[PDB]
Amino acid sequence: VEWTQQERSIIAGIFANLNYEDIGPKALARCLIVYPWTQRYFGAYGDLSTPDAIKGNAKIAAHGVKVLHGLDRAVKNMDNINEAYSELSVLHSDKLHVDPDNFRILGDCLTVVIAANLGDAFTVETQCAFQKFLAVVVFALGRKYH
């Protein structure tokens, strides 16, 4: 909620160089494999029978990119995250019925994927800022559950 200039810079820098078509699918596939209850929501997405099927699923991949671009509004409106995610929160609550604990789990998967991508560049400061960002976004997404 109170961002430093370094934190803002770190977040902008991550998203500025992000390959969404690489990271998005990886983070979502990993989520579905490591925490398989998240597969609940994707019954219309085709074959999810094995980890190989999930990794190869084009519709899951496309959704991974969509979800990751869902973080964009937060990066552009870092001081107004709660309001920016209001509608997305009611969507997940009232239409999709997504258990909001899953937002936290996806965030952890995304962290692992970004760490693997960035290697040494994923410094302690970077992880601090990214975790803070994720915590705010995940809270914003849970806000309208009733």
Binding site: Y35, P36, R40, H97, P100, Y145
Partner: protein, 143 residues
């Protein structure tokens, strides 16, 4: 974590006292889970009503506590005993196991509310350990 002899005998003794009101404890605990922790409602959207004391809540409270009664019966081997229940939660409902701790807490609150004399700190540690074991047994088949 493993249940000691003391834990097992404490849980069985408490179950003997409260089992007569199992259905009521279940309905009340589920009703409270849904109202107090509205994130849990996401698994029940197919129900016509989720309000406390509603038909769906009463009926499901009954089922849940029968699962608890089964766990008490199979307290020496909860992994094996709750295997089928674990499979249903793992693959049919696909409930995020983090929610099991929420229901556990609501059961404890209701047991306290209904049986204040019986629910001593000593019974509380054992029942909390027991419900943790049930949660873990329920999570067994997920991955």
């Amino acid at each position: 974590t493993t249940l000691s002899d003391k834990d097992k005998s404490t849980v069985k003794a408490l179950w003997g006292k409260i089992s007569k009101s199992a259905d009521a404890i279940g309905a009340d605990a589920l009703g409270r889970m849904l109202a107090v922790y509205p994130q849990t409602k996401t698994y029940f959207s197919h129900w016509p009503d989720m309000s406390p004391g509603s038909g769906p809540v009463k009926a499901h409270g009954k089922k849940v506590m029968g699962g608890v009664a089964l766990a008490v019966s199979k307290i020496d081997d909860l992994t094996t005993g709750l295997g089928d229940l674990s499979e249903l939660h793992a693959f049919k409902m696909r409930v995020d196991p983090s929610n099991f701790k929420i229901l556990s807490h609501c059961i404890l609150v209701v047991v306290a509310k209904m049986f204040p004399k019986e629910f001593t700190p000593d019974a509380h540690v054992s029942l909390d350990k027991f419900l943790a074991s049930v949660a873990l047994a329920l999570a067994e088949r997920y991955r």
